[PDB]
Symmetry: C2
């Protein structure tokens, strides 16, 4: 079990397929930002990107030749926009999406590098930057941060990331092993919901 | 997937073993309140209660004779304190724990009655009542609610309940089916983290 201050701690412990699943989840949640941008500026790349991301998800339960991975990253780079070459805001979330998928692909080649923490921060920043651009003009810093605290996009993003990480954290096979983890989490080392224990 | 306002909605859809697991999780998190009370007032019932709760958890993956269930509830009633017969506060969380376990036991006999919503509200109220008693004396209502909003026991309880419900919500066998649900949740019906879609 992880307390209300232990999101980043579960994230920091993700490894193997669970880390990949978390990275792909962050990218999937961002994908329509890529599709919308590609459409808006008349690129015909939305469909090709959807396939590359589909393939990244399929790779979770398939062997893939290491030798094949650099070409996948190369394809991604050709679909990835340069933020300086487009004036519309939408290019920024489009680029952020590509960075998320890049991490998931790089992780297949170099799985031992930890990525989930920084990918999670990036995924949050996409939402914060968008709220700031769309609603923050003329606000003092402290007003903006009050907008952030109650903004539904940021409340939802936070709980999406946490739900995903925690679903992965508890997941086990078979069912019995899953229930043992859920139980252990509730038991909380013998410390109740009121912060007391029979120590 | 469930948004930041959809905790109670996932809870309301729990059924079968998942509902039982959620009820048992709420009781397990409360159990040390029972143990502490039983100890404090010199009852020798903590160990007997621990066994009954252990049995409730074991029942999750075992057939049990319906005919045996009323006797389990009867045993629980004999371990359950009357709040009016003890002056110390600790009796109240002790009683709340018994109510949580009672729901889990009743659910085995009558599984079709929905219980998780009200059990979740009770489990929250235990923490709110305790914060109010221990810290709220002399506070205006609106001050108290500001304490509630940032109190670590209440922040943690909220995320414990949500982590548990969501772990159950996503769980499937085999691994592939679990990953399909996690993916679907991230895809969010084609609506990105910025609230946009290619509709
Ligand atoms: Na890694
Ligand atoms: Na039920």
């Amino acid at each position: 079990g992880m307390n209300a201050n232990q999101f980043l701690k579960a994230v920091s412990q993700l490894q193997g397929w669970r880390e990949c699943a978390f990275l792909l989840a962050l990218a999937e949640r961002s994908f329509p930002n890529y599709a919308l941008f590609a459409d808006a500026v008349g690129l015909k790349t939305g469909g090709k990107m959807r396939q590359l991301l589909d393939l990244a998800w399929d790779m979770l339960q398939k062997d893939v030749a290491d030798a094949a991975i650099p070409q996948l990253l190369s394809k991604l780079e050709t679909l990835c926009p340069n933020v300086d070459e487009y004036d519309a805001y939408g290019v920024y979330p489009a680029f952020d999406f590509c960075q998320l998928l890049e991490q998931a692909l790089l992780n297949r080649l170099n799985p031992n590098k930890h990525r989930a923490t920084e990918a999670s921060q990036l995924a949050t920043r996409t939402v914060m930057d968008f709220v700031e651009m769309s609603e923050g003009e003329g606000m003092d810093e402290n007003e903006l941060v009050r907008v952030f605290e109650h903004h539904p996009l940021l409340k939802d993003d936070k709980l999406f990331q946490r739900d995903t990480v925690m679903a992965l954290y508890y997941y086990r096979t078979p069912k019995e092993a899953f229930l043992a983890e859920l139980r252990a989490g509730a038991a909380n080392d013998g410390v109740s919901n009121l912060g007391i224990s029979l120590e």
